[PDB]
Amino acid sequence: DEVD
Amino acid sequence: DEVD
Amino acid sequence: KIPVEADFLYAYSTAPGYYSWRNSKDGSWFIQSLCAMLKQYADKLEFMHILTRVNRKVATEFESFSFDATFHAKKQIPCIVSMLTKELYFYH
Amino acid sequence: KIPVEADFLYAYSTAPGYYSWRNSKDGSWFIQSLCAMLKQYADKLEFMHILTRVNRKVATEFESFSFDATFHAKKQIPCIVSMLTKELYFYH
Amino acid sequence: SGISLDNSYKMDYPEMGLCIIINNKNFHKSTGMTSRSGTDVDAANLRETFRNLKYEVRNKNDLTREEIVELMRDVSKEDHSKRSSFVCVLLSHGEEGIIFGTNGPVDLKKITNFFRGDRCRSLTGKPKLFIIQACRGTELDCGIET
Amino acid sequence: SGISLDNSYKMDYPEMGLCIIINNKNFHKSTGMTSRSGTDVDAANLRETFRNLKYEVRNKNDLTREEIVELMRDVSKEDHSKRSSFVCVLLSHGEEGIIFGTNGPVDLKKITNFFRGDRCRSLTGKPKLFIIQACRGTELDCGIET
Structure with a gap:
């Protein structure tokens, strides 16, 4: 999971 | 009419 | 787990950045209207639909009048x- | 007349001030979920209920995993x- | 039992819950804020409306920023186990993300944080409604003739 | 005719309307923004989903801030008379109130203003939907065990  |  | 910000509803009287x-x-235009709709539809409609x-x-x-x-x-x-x-009904 | 800001709907993937x-x-968690719910309920529920x-x-x-x-x-x-x-249904 | 969907919040708890109404009409002279004429009409309308929905209505008038925070903290520390939901109505001057106490502003985030899913466990999973009658800036909507 | 209530938007126009999807995956090196891996999966899912709802889907990839504004301006200037609604999906990096073009930020307000009730008359009274997949800050939700 990564963040925008 | 008035504003808050 | 659920988000700590989950299950909150903010019924703002006006759009972001605007006077109310x-x-x-x-x-107030908003409260007048909110109470009128709750009195008329709280036992019939889901909360988002009432709003x-x-x-x-x-x-x-409503439209303002000013000198x-x-x-x-x-x-x-x-x-x-x-x-x-979830959907929210004031009745059951 | 109607407000120039009326009839807008903003479906944000996350709460104000938070990462997405x-x-x-x-x-994305949001788009994955949005498409899944539209595919399953667009011909059955009002848009606010789908959201x-x-x-x-x-x-x-969903819950993040990170080293x-x-x-x-x-x-x-x-x-x-x-x-x-007004209420919004994608079907008629 | 039969199929259970859980698409709507459980609203059949013994109590519907609290409806806290903060009605700020008179502000300290030093703040330079005007009196909010007509807010008592709003407060009374709300009190009756939510009373009929079976909420335990508590009206508070002219609270300072300190009293607002204290009230919210105290309320969030009550046992809401037998309550279906929580409602808070704010009537005051305001700006984006801010509500005014009689002596100064209060961040809305500070008020709502008391009710976070992890900070008020007896309301976790239950609807927390905040109704806000206050300005969110100084923009005016010119409207459009339909 | 019989009683008419007008509680739901008229969605039986000849066309459902446009669904503009702005899919920004690769950003200019100078911006220091990372590539948004997985966004193509989102773009394809959206394209198919709205296609099935009968929207005229238009996918745009890696648009600069200038191209985003130009696209929105041009779209708002089309004749939407025979369209029931308008949908715009934004997939990119972002911050509160901002969406990133491949070379810099764009205020969301600037994009939405093109569709104001007074600036896009063929959409006045019709639903304008903006779906935004982007950050709105840097806060993290720790969650709470239920």
Whole structure:
């Protein structure tokens, strides 16, 4: 999971 | 009419 | 787990960045409308649908009157902000 | 007249001030959920109700995994912002 | 039992819950804020409306920023186990993300944080409604003739 | 005719309307923004989903801030008379109130203003939907065990  |  | 910000509903009287109108004799446009719609639909409609009726009532039935041209003939649209995770009915 | 800001709906993937999560392989939590709920309920439910299902799906079925403790085991709640004045059904 | 969907919040708890109404009409002279004429009409309308929905309505008038925070903290520390939901109505001057106490502003985030899913466990999973009658800036909507 | 209520938007126009999808995956090196891996999965899912709802889907990839504004301006200037609604999906990096073009930020307000009730008359009274997949800050939700 990564963040925008 | 008035504003808050 | 669930988000700590989940299950919150913010019924704002006006859109982000805008003034909100209040009549010194009749009360605020938003609260007047909100109470009217809850009294008429709380035992019939889901809360988001009630608030949508409030949006339409405020948007259509109200327009400011002011001796100051800058504040005259203005409109208002409430702003429903939902982080709810289920439908909400005040009755069961 | 109607407000110039009336009839707008902003379906935000996350709450104000928060990061929004995206899986490099499965796509973003929000869009994954939004498309799934539209495919399953667009011919059955009013749009606000569909978005509420999206809120519940994102809130319950997703939790971040990260080697960085700061970003591990976090949650997300989408944010529905409605200035709509009527119910919205994609079918008729 | 039969199929259970859980698409709507459980609203059949013994109590519907609290409806806290903060009605700020008179502000300290030093703040330079005007009296909010007509707010009592709003407060009374709300009190009756939520009373009929079976909420335990508590009306508070002219609270300072300190009293607002204290009230919210105290309320969030009550046992809401037998309550279906929580409602808070704010009537005051305001700006984006801010509500005014009689002596100064209060961040809305500070008020709502008391009710976070992790800070008020007896309301976790239950709807928390905040109704806000206050300005969110100084923009005016000119409208459009339909 | 019989009683008419007008509680739902008229969605039986000849066309459902446009669904503009702005899919920004690769950003200019100078911006220091990372590539948004997985966004193509989102873009394809959206394209198919709205296609099935009968929207005229237009996918745009890696648009600069200038191209985003130009696209929105041009779209708002089309004749939407025979369209029931308008949908715009934004997939990119972002911060509160901002969406990133491949070379810099764009205020969301600037994009939405093109569709104001007074600036896009063929959409006045019709639903304008903006779906935004992007950060709105840097806060993290720790969640709470239920």
